[PDB]
Amino acid sequence: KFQYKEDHPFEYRKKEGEKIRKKYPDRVPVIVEKAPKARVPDLDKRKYLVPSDLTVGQFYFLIRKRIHLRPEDALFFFVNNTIPPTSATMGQLYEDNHEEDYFLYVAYSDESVYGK
């Protein structure tokens, strides 16, 4: 359901992920988009090059700042429809959840359950 996948077929996405992993080998590519039904602002950009040793919390902080929420606006992130463990790094999430186009897909929402 991500817009990046509605916009580009698999082979295009794979060739982009492959090319990015070869050009920036110490980064992992991550597509960040709103979850279905989410009532949250859009990000300016959806394609991120993430340092593999970022912790999940550090990633949350960086993405949250780009959404420009008020502090009182809650924010949740999902990988494969589940909130990731906080104790992970983004390289771990990528190792365990990247798709066959070489991208990790992260959804975000105001709600704590994906697709609510």
Partner: peptide, 10 residues
Amino acid sequence: DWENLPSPRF
């Protein structure tokens, strides 16, 4: 297009 995220520092 892409956004390169920073790393934290000691």
